Amino acid sequence: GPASAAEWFRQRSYDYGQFPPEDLARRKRELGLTVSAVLPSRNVADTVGGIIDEIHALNERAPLIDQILVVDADSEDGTAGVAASHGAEVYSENELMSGYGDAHGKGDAMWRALSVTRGDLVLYIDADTRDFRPQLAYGVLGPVLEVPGVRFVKAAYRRPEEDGGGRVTELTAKPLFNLFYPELAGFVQPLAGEFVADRELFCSIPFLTGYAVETGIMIDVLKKVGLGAMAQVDLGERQNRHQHLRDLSRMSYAVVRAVARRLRQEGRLQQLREPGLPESFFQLSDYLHAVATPEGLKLQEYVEELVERPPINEVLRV
Amino acid sequence: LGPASAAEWFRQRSYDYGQFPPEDLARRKRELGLTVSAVLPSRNVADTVGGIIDEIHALNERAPLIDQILVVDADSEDGTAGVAASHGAEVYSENELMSGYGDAHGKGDAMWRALSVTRGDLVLYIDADTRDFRPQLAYGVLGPVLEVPGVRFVKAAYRRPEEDGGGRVTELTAKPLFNLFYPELAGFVQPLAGEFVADRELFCSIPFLTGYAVETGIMIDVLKKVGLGAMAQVDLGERQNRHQHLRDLSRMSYAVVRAVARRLRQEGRLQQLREPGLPESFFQLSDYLHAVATPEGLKLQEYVEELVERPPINEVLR
Numbered sequence: 001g002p003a004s005a006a007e008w009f010r011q012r013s014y015d016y017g018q019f020p021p022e023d024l025a026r027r028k029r030e031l032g033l034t035v036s037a038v039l040p041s042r043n044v045a046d047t048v049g050g051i052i053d054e055i056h057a058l059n060e061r062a063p064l065i066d067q068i069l070v071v072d073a074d075s076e077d078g079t080a081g082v083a084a085s086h087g088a089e090v091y092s093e094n095e096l097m098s099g100y101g102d103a104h105g106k107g108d109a110m111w112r113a114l115s116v117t118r119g120d121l122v123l124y125i126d127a128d129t130r131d132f133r134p135q136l137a138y139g140v141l142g143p144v145l146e147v148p149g150v151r152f153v154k155a156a157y158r159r160p161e162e163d164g165g166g167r168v169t170e171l172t173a174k175p176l177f178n179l180f181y182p183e184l185a186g187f188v189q190p191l192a193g194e195f196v197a198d199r200e201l202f203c204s205i206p207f208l209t210g211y212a213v214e215t216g217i218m219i220d221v222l223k224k225v226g227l228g229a230m231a232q233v234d235l236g237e238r239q240n241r242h243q244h245l246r247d248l249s250r251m252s253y254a255v256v257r258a259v260a261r262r263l264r265q266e267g268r269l270q271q272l273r274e275p276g277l278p279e280s281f282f283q284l285s286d287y288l289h290a291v292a293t294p295e296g297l298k299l300q301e302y303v304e305e306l307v308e309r310p311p312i313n314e315v316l317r318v
Numbered sequence: 319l320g321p322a323s324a325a326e327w328f329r330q331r332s333y334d335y336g337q338f339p340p341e342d343l344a345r346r347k348r349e350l351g352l353t354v355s356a357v358l359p360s361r362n363v364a365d366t367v368g369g370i371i372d373e374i375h376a377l378n379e380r381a382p383l384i385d386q387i388l389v390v391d392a393d394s395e396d397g398t399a400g401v402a403a404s405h406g407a408e409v410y411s412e413n414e415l416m417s418g419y420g421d422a423h424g425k426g427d428a429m430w431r432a433l434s435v436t437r438g439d440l441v442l443y444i445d446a447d448t449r450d451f452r453p454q455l456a457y458g459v460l461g462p463v464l465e466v467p468g469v470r471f472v473k474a475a476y477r478r479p480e481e482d483g484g485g486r487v488t489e490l491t492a493k494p495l496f497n498l499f500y501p502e503l504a505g506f507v508q509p510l511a512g513e514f515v516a517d518r519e520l521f522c523s524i525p526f527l528t529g530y531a532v533e534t535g536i537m538i539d540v541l542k543k544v545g546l547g548a549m550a551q552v553d554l555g556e557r558q559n560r561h562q563h564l565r566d567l568s569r570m571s572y573a574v575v576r577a578v579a580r581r582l583r584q585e586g587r588l589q590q591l592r593e594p595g596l597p598e599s600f601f602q603l604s605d606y607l608h609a610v611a612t613p614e615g616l617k618l619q620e621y622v623e624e625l626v627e628r629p630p631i632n633e634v635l636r
């Protein structure tokens with residue numbers, strides 16, 4: 001395995017420039033591999049159309065993506081119809097793994113998607129990217145297709161200069177990973193939605209359902225394949241999204257919850273509830289967010305249960 | 319028995335500074351014979367400490383509340399010392415106080431050492447970098463210590479100029495971490511606030527973490543010492559934001575994480591932190607690894623900060 005974070009960073013970081021699309025396509029045909037691109041799509045009517053159009057144009061020059069799969073996460077904006085009218089295979093998430101109830105977020109979408117992905121490789125992609133450059137499709141395929149032993153590949157990129165990622169990455173994930181999962185500290189965008197692996201890998205791990213999904217995947221893939229089999233590819237620039245700091249806070253909470261849950265399974269965290277601490281203070285699903293408003297201080301409460309899906313292998317018709 | 323919930327505490331222990339007219343506070347302070355020291359941990363703040371001291375003096379004219387003003391200077395290159403002295407504050411070098419401990423390890427070291435020169439029954443910590451120092455920044459948090467019996471420790475609450483739950487580190491690191499591991503603290507609007515007051519005995523009876531981890535350690539240790547019902551916060555109105563770079567915030571977030579981790583390890587909630595099989599080269603809590611994307615490629619950068627716990631100053635000074 002890798003000797004240190006730094007040795008991994010050196011051996012397992014690439015630029016998209018090292019994998020021209022033509023070459024990859026040649027290689028893929030040679031390997032006899034297929035690729036499903038999965039777009040978990042929640043109210044992305046203004047963007048999925050463009051992404052699908054670009055994947056299509058890419059496939060013109062170099063056939064790399066076999067299945068374009070949009071999973072509509074109960075959108076109210078016309079997402080499903082936009083995706084459909086641009087030629088993607090579209091599924092509502094309610095209709096997949098239907099015995100599971102209704103959509104419980106990005107993770108649930110990404111997980112359920114596996115039941116209809118046909119490719120040997122599953123490439124997850126963010127559906128909300130505003131100017132989708134071809135390399136957001138193929139860049140991460142580079143190392144899975146060409147480097148022995150590499151099994152999982154994450155995007156790295158920068159906003160429009162030293163980009164350590166968005167705010168949840170910078171202030172929640174990187175700090176927690178440095179402390180608890182030092183092997184993950186070399187990833188530039190550990191929470192990126194573009195990543196690819198063998199379909200079998202994804203079918204064999206649990207998926208956290210909400211925002212914590214990328215966090216749980218990073219940790220579980222690490223434990224499964226080892227750091228040496230993980231890589232990242234510099235894809236250049238990505239206009240980061242805008243969001244309200246107030247809403248990032250609950251996303252940060254999910255990241256925390258995911259680490260805490262994994263720490264508890266490893267046995268590093270035990271007796272999470274402090275003996276002495278009254279029951280009334282203890283409710284993990286209950287997030288309190290104290291704020292100051294022009295009208296006084298207020299205690300806001302958010303209730304989100306941390307739902308987790310089992311390895312879909314265990315639960316899908318074989 | 320204490321508050322039965324964070325919401326119960328939030329109602330009973332949150333105040334507005336309007337509830338504590340300074341002249342009323344001054345009377346009660348006089349009646350009890352209490353003195354107050356104001357401690358300003360100062361690193362390169364020549365442009366702001368002048369006003370702060372000035373304003374504190376102006377407030378004492380209407381209502382004597384601060385008996386001693388201590389500027390503890392981190393050997394600023396900007397003439398902080400001269401400014402503060404000429405404005406009539408007492409000035410001390412952080413490296414001269416408690417010098418047997420060597421040179422100072424950042425903000426927390428300076429705050430701890432100051433306890434060797436504060437003579438006040440009560441110690442009020444204040445930010446030295448505030449641009450517009452309003453009167454209530456000097457008296458607001460004194461309200462409950464003085465007027466509410468049972469209350470020993472009071473934290474500032476405030477908003478930036480619809481719903482302010484704090485700066486990025488507070489929002490994305492502290493609140494998430496406290497919600498999970500220290501739910502008793504989730505009602506604090508500004509848990510990492512630099513301005514807060516307690517009795518000197520209390521401060522002398524707890525360790526201080528050095529560096530940026532100090533505010534976190536204090537919250538957790540005060541909580542354990544006196545209980546939630548003895549803590550309060552007071553809304554102080556509008557506080558200007560001092561904005562900084564998302565990169566540098568990452569190191570600060572990591573200090574919050576480190577402070578929580580250490581307390582968890584000491585309680586026994588966290589154990590066997592270094593996973594077995596993880597090569598020694600990966601495990602170094604003082605080394606923060608910060609992966610970034612630059613226009614010249616991906617870069618793994620590294621920040622080193624030794625975390626030091628100063629003992630309760632009572633154990634040093636008999």
Ligand SMILES: [Cl-]
Nearest residue numbers: 260261284306
């Ligand atoms: Cl859990």
Ligand SMILES: [Cl-]
Nearest residue numbers: 284285305306
């Ligand atoms: Cl839950």
Ligand SMILES: [Cl-]
Nearest residue numbers: 579580603625
């Ligand atoms: Cl430690």
Ligand SMILES: [Cl-]
Nearest residue numbers: 603604624625
């Ligand atoms: Cl250390």
Ligand SMILES: [Mg+2]
Nearest residue numbers: 283284286287
């Ligand atoms: Mg809770």
Ligand SMILES: [Mg+2]
Nearest residue numbers: 602603605606
């Ligand atoms: Mg380290």
